[PDB]
Design a protein around this nucleic acid. Structure first.
Ligand SMILES: [Zn+2]
Ligand SMILES: [Zn+2]
Ligand SMILES: [Zn+2]
Length: 131
DNA sequence: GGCGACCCGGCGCCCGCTACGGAGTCAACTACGGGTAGGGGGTATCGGGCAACGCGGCACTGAACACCGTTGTCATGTGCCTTG
C-alpha cells in the first residue's frame, strides 16, 4: 500500500488493518480497534492517512445518514457499487454498464460537459430477519 | 697440640642541610633469504542532513439537536341585553 508520504511503520499498520477489515468503518472506531491491537497511534495522524487513502482512491468512501464518513478498501480496481447492510456491514461490489450508459445519455441530453455519479443502494439483510 | 702472639684479612664507620662548576672520547665483511611492513586500491559499513508526520488542545464544523422563553391559538367560559 504505497502512500504519497514517506513510508513508515504506522501507515503500514493502518493499511494492514484496512486489509484485514472488509467492512465499512468510521475513523473513530477504526482508531478504537487500532488501539485495541496495541499500536497506540494518534487520532489526527490516522485522519491524515485515511484521507490520503481516500484521495488516492484505493479505498472507497461512503457517507452515512448521520453524516459520518466511512471507508473500506476494494479488491478490484474498476469502479463498482457496494450493497451494504446497516446491521451487518457486508459490503459486496457490483457494477453495471446500464447505469453508466444512462448517466452518459442524461448528460448528453442536458448538454452537460462532465459528470460524476454517486449511487448507493441500502436494504435489509437476508439473515437479519431470521432469528 | 692446644696455646699464643701475630698476622692477616676483613670489615665497619667516618655531624647536618641547603646551594654550587663543567665534562663525556680509540681497532671486518658480504651474501643471502625471509618476513614484516609500508604503499595504494578498492569495498562494506556506519554516520550525518532534510520535510511529513506523529500528537493535543482546542477549535471550528455548526449540525443537530435540546432548554427555557415566548405570544401563537383555540374552543370554550362570564356579563349585558332582549324576549319569554
Ligand atoms: Zn469500492
Ligand atoms: Zn457506478
Ligand atoms: Zn445484515
Amino acid at each position: 500500500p504505497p502512500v504519497k508520504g514517506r513510508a513508515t511503520r504506522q501507515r503500514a499498520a493502518v493499511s494492514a488493518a484496512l486489509q484485514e477489515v472488509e467492512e465499512f468503518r468510521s475513523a473513530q472506531e477504526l482508531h478504537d480497534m487500532l488501539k485495541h491491537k496495541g499500536d497506540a497511534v494518534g487520532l489526527t495522524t490516522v485522519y491524515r492517512t485515511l484521507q490520503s487513502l481516500a484521495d488516492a482512491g484505493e479505498v472507497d468512501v461512503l457517507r452515512t445518514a448521520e453524516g459520518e464518513s466511512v471507508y473500506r478498501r476494494c479488491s478490484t480496481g474498476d469502479h463498482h457499487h457496494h450493497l451494504v447492510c446497516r446491521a451487518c456491514g457486508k459490503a459486496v461490489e457490483v457494477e453495471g454498464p446500464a447505469v453508466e450508459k444512462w448517466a452518459e445519455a442524461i448528460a448528453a441530453e442536458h448538454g452537460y460537459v462532465n459528470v460524476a455519479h454517486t449511487v448507493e443502494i441500502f436494504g435489509t439483510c437476508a439473515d437479519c430477519a431470521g432469528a
